[PDB]
Amino acid sequence: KETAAAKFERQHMDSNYCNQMMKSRNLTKDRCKPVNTFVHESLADVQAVCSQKNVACKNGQTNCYQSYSTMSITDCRETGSSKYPNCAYKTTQANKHIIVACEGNPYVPVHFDASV
């Protein structure tokens, strides 16, 4: 079974596109997930964000970290028309700073908090 670090990688790393990848990574085989972000950078460069700028997470906890640089990301958002089984997504490509929450030893991303 899947750890939180492994779930982060399957759902968000990728070292229309959203419809295809949401299905392949098992996000939409059994439900339609409203939003998801994929990061087009190497896994080790995203893991490196856990020792970069420490910030508060949306929830007020402090194990969040903001990347110094922008990274290539694709945002996938369900259309207002989407309904399981027919999930449908609008694909937006952008270069943004990511914010991830980190836990464990090794201290690795376990949640994608935001892009800015």
Curated annotation (Swiss-Prot):
Keyword terms: Disulfide bond, Endonuclease, Glycation, Glycoprotein, Hydrolase, Lyase, Nuclease, Secreted, Signal
GO biological process, one term: defense response to Gram-positive bacterium
Annotated EC: 4.6.1.18
Disulfide bond listed as a keyword: yes
Location(s) in or outside the cell: Secreted
Active site positions, chain numbering: H12 (proton acceptor), H111 (proton donor)
Tissues with expression: Pancreas.
Predominant subcellular localization, coarse grouping: secreted
Annotated catalysed reactions: an [RNA] containing cytidine + H2O = an [RNA]-3'-cytidine-3'-phosphate + a 5'-hydroxy-ribonucleotide-3'-[RNA]; an [RNA] containing uridine + H2O = an [RNA]-3'-uridine-3'-phosphate + a 5'-hydroxy-ribonucleotide-3'-[RNA]
Glycosylated sites: K1, K7, N26, K29, K33
GO-annotated cellular components: extracellular region
Membership in a protein family: Belongs to the pancreatic ribonuclease family.
Task performed by this protein: Endonuclease that catalyzes the cleavage of RNA on the 3' side of pyrimidine nucleotides. Acts on single-stranded and double-stranded RNA.
Descriptive protein name: Ribonuclease pancreatic
